[PDB]
């Protein structure tokens, strides 16, 4: 259960 | 005739779980007091996708209008903050603020480097941001470019391109200009007309937990 | 200057940006001290992909061997911790620990419901985990199954399946068993034979900031 995302 | 209650909260920094908690806390308070609207003074450089989506979802379920106000001058609603804006009932921006710049990445590396997002993720967020723009009648074409071209916009640009509804210097001007505006998304199934004639402004303080987390962040 | 030194540090909780900083701080100390190795006692239930990838990178670039030790009994290197393990010079597991369950997710809904990733991003993390395993000569079939089957393994299983190199109850047993072993990845371009005879063991205390930030992320 690795949490994937952020954004720039 | 009637006295309309408007709440005003500040939400600052990276979008995380604690941010969701702030959105949930401040919105719940406004709902229980039968508020006309809650305004959120938002300043964010970005943050986590799941929390962002949870915030958009919390805003959809809201029993009162949520106005996202990019404030103060110098603030931005970049990356995750843009989706929150687009997912809300009305967007305002103060002079000298920014919206857009939403090209997803897996994250930043040690030496300034950026870990690329696989195309699927990119396409997934394109569809999501277009959807939010479509559902709220905002410019989906431009919203896509927030991702595909890392497009960022001034308030005057954002209004002209039909991404936001209001350019305002303070809470006073915001209420004045947004009075009589229909919300861009429904509140419980119907599109509410905002009544800001005879308004009581109430400011919500951040909680101890809010302040602690952010002071740690400031280091 | 003519000493054989092994540093031991502790890393507990969610793998985040701050966990990166910890790995970097501990590894840097050991590098500047010309340590024979650093042993990282790891207990993590989950974490973020970007921090995970930065940690793996930092381990790949380490000037000394990094030994990932799933410790104490009851610890797990689940989710992001598994990648960190597979990305390192040697993996040890204490009796009663766990490794695996690495399915990538977009995160958690308001419910606590699982927000799954698009199928293609599952394939991206499959490629990534297979790469780590084949670069370190470890069982990439089983590694793939950490994702596709949410597969989790006990120490003895992980050993039998060629995913880890050591099962050890404590640091002293770890040193005794791993002594003479080649690292599974290079240190500065060369595979290295661990020399743990006549070794001085130095424990690096987690700082107040480490314990506090961990405790806060906990709740
Ligand atoms: Cl050697």
Residue numbers in the entry:
A (entry chain C): 234 to 241
B (entry chain B), C (entry chain A): 19 to 237
What does the paper say about this structure?
The N-terminal region of STOPP PH1510p (residues 16–236, 1510-N) is a thermostable serine protease with a catalytic Ser–Lys dyad (Ser97 and Lys138), and specifically cleaves the C-terminal hydrophobic region of the p-stomatin PH1511p (235VIVL↓MLPM242 in which the arrow indicates the point cleaved). Membrane-bound proteases play several important roles in protein quality control and regulation. In both archaeal and bacterial species, p-stomatin and STOPP (stomatin operon partner protein) genes probably form an operon. The flexible L2 loops of 1510-N cover the peptide, and are involved in the protease activity.
Using the heat-treatment complex of 1510-N K138A and 234P10 peptide, crystals were obtained under the condition similar to that of the no heat-treatment complex obtained previously, and the structure was determined. The structure with heat treatment determined here is fitted to the structure with no heat-treatment determined previously, resulting in a low root-mean-square (r.m.s.) difference of 0.15 Å for Cα atoms of the 1510-N dimer, and 0.40 Å for all atoms of the peptide. The result indicates that the structure with heat treatment is almost identical to that with no heat-treatment. The N-terminal half of the peptide (234NVIVL238) shows clear electron densities, whereas the C-terminal half of the peptide (239MLP241) shows weak densities. Almost all the main-chain nitrogen and carboxyl oxygen atoms of 234NVIVL238 are hydrogen-bonded to the protease. The main-chain atoms of 239MLP241 have fewer hydrogen bonds than 234NVIVL238. According to the superposition between the structures with heat-treatment and with no heat-treatment, the 234NVIVL238 peptide is superposed well, whereas the 239MLP241 peptide is slightly deviated.
